[PDB]
Amino acid sequence: PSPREQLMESIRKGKELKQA
Amino acid sequence: VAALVVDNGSGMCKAGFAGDDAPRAVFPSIVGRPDSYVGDEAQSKRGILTLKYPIEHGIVTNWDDMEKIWHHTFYNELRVAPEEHPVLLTEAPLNPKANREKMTQIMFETFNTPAMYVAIQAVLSLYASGRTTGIVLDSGDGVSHTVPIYEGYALPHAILRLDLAGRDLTDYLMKILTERGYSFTTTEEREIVRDIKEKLCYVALDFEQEMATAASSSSLEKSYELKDGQVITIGNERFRCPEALFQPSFLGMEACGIHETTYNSIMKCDVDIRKDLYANTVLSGGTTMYPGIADRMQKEITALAPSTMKIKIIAPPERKYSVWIGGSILASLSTFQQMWISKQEYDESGPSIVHRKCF
Numbered sequence: 511p512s513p514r515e516q517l518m519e520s521i522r523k524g525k526e527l528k529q530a
Numbered sequence: 531v532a533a534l535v536v537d538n539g540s541g542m543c544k545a546g547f548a549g550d551d552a553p554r555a556v557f558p559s560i561v562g563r564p565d566s567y568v569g570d571e572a573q574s575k576r577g578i579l580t581l582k583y584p585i586e587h588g589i590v591t592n593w594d595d596m597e598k599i600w601h602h603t604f605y606n607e608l609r610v611a612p613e614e615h616p617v618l619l620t621e622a623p624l625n626p627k628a629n630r631e632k633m634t635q636i637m638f639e640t641f642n643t644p645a646m647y648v649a650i651q652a653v654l655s656l657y658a659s660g661r662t663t664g665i666v667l668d669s670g671d672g673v674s675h676t677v678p679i680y681e682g683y684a685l686p687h688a689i690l691r692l693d694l695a696g697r698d699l700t701d702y703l704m705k706i707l708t709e710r711g712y713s714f715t716t717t718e719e720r721e722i723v724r725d726i727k728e729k730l731c732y733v734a735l736d737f738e739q740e741m742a743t744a745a746s747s748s749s750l751e752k753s754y755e756l757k758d759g760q761v762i763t764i765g766n767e768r769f770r771c772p773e774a775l776f777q778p779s780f781l782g783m784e785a786c787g788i789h790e791t792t793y794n795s796i797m798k799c800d801v802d803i804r805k806d807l808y809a810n811t812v813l814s815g816g817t818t819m820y821p822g823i824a825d826r827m828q829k830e831i832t833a834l835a836p837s838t839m840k841i842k843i844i845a846p847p848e849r850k851y852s853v854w855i856g857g858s859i860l861a862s863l864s865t866f867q868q869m870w871i872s873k874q875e876y877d878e879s880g881p882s883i884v885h886r887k888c889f
């Protein structure tokens with residue numbers, strides 16, 4: 511998996527975002 | 531340290547932190563001069579100033595004012611400094627190569643950004659939804675774009691542009707209310723009509739049927755109360771306004787509606803990717819916020835698409851800010867960390883490194 515392949519896989523995985 | 535996400539639009543700018551889930555700063559894209567004000571401050575002093583919009587239809591047309599907006603963004607708005615942080619900027623689909631280079635030059639040489647990146651606005655909205663492949667309808671204040679995206683790549687040959695958005699719809703609502711009785715002459719009155727548009731207007735599933743419903747009873751009417759107490763009543767104008775999105779003819783335009791523009795874009799792509807696009811049609815931008823737009827888009831594309839096809843319209847509940855949020859996700863990823871452009875990399879190559887690094 512290329513550095514870009516692993517970027518797209520992280521986007522599809524999603525992530526938690528911060529607070530205020 | 532956290533990166534910054536700056537999303538500049540035709541009407542509004544969105545600024546904050548990569549890591550956050552909402553932009554901290556949201557303000558008009560207005561630079562005012564009679565020595566120079568930006569954003570909220572400038573809209574008030576309009577009486578003593580000439581107001582300028584650096585971003586026309588998503589494209590930066592003035593670079594001196596764009597500098598002033600960006601400056602106000604860090605120092606005045608975010609109360610931080612550009613040389614401490616990496617900066618994620620957003621660009622319009624089919625942004626001229628030179629504009630991209632000038633955007634890279636201004637960051638590094640004028641603000642001394644240690645790192646920067648420029649991403650396409652629609653691509654970011656797709657990311658915000660949790661997809662990497664799909665088609666995005668981005669309708670803002672100045673421009674509507676239909677952008678088919680394959681694994682992060684916006685497909686330039688298949689991107690379509692329509693200069694019909696929120697600003698045009700605000701003006702259209704003014705006109706049809708003027709026809710019905712009311713007079714909207716001042717800019718403080720336009721900012722009211724714009725609010726009416728954002729509060730009450732909706733997209734009809736069947737326009738002709740809805741017009742018949744509005745002509746037989748008052749069931750579709752809503753009352754908007756003014757600051758002075760006076761109440762105005764709106765009937766079919768509620769859905770006739772955003773109808774112009776599907777029938778540009780309402781504005782005297784010879785153009786396909788957002789639905790057929792979306793269809794036409796899918797039909798310009800490779801035949802083997804369409805079936806994913808039809809089922810991954812994401813809506814973004816402030817002008818896609820009308821209640822019932824998702825169901826209408828669904829209905830209209832179903833009529834144009836193969837009858838066997840799965841049609842799915844994704845309208846993220848927050849989509850008014852999906853561009854910024856998509857950037858706030860992207861710039862926060864540990865996997866993305868090496869895809870920035872360092873100040874070193876700029877000093878070694880020049881502005882034209884943007885093309886080989888940002889795609």
Ligand SMILES: Nc1ncnc2c1ncn2[C@@H]1O[C@H](COP(=O)(O)OP(=O)(O)OP(=O)(O)O)[C@@H](O)[C@H]1O
Binds near residue numbers: 539729814850
């Ligand atoms: N709830 C709503 N319903 C309808 N329209 C809305 C709503 N909220 C905002 N808008 C409209 O969306 C526009 C702003 O959206 P957005 O910030 O996505 O556009 P922009 O990025 O400033 O401009 P562009 O994308 O065209 O460059 C404004 O014209 C506003 O009137």
Ligand SMILES: [Ca+2]
Binds near residue numbers: 538539540651815
């Ligand atoms: Ca925009």
